[PDB]
Design a protein around this ligand. Sequence first.
Ligand SMILES: [Pt+2]
Ligand SMILES: [Pt+2]
Ligand SMILES: [Zn+2]
Length: 295
Amino acid sequence: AMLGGIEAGGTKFVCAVGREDGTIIDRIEFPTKMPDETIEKVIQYFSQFSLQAIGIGSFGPVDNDKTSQTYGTITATPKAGWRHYPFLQTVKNEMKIPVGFSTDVNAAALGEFLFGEAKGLDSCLYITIGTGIGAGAIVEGRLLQGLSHPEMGHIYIRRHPDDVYQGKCPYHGDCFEGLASGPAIEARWGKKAADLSDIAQVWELEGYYIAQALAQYILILAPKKIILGGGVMQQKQVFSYIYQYVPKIMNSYLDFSELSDDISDYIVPPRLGSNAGIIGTLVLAHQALQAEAAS
Ligand SMILES: [Pt+2]
Ligand SMILES: [Pt+2]
Ligand SMILES: [Zn+2]
């Protein structure tokens, strides 16, 4: 019972072979180039194995509406060739097995939901903070997919009055992603976020911005668990600032231990570490296998 997973990123692809229980048997990664050549490497890798199903967790925005004619395509990107490229259908045609599809952050949510910090809950929110900011949510045991998958990284948050930086986001300027991504931190402070590990106000400001976004998510979605991943969150100091700031912003408006005394157990790193996403693609594979077995 072997499953394939593809975590399709703007900078690299990770492909993996694994099991329904989240075990990774083998993996490979390679640079993301143009679609045809990138997907050829995927097919060449998976050809070694005899797979029952594949799951794709993709960068987006994507068309994640199963009834849509453009289901399983990337709908917006500055990356050459990728917009409107028949990603899902190409993998289906080449592999001729069930192929599940979702956003990359949705897959990471499913990973943590089945095997990580939200195991035993029926709700969670997984947020990645790195090159960009995105989130996937589980509601009553199911991925949140309304009119679109969410794009929680592009919400406006309150600018810190001392912060002068104009914002990295090509669409909004100073949305959450514009103010608080990896590339935003770098462009603001003039150094990459590792030379800055020692400057406390970088992570104070970052923690402040993340806390502002989290208060919004808590008031709108009220997830039962918030999982923070991505390269930025490797600066573990940011968590302590978030823990300080969230109760301050909400000012005792909602009385739950998750939001006050036990906040450090509510907003957490992924149990699966940097592998939540690729493991979640195996969950997507398994779901596609189950859904086809019940045709
Ligand atoms: Pt090309
Ligand atoms: Pt295959
Ligand atoms: Zn934006």
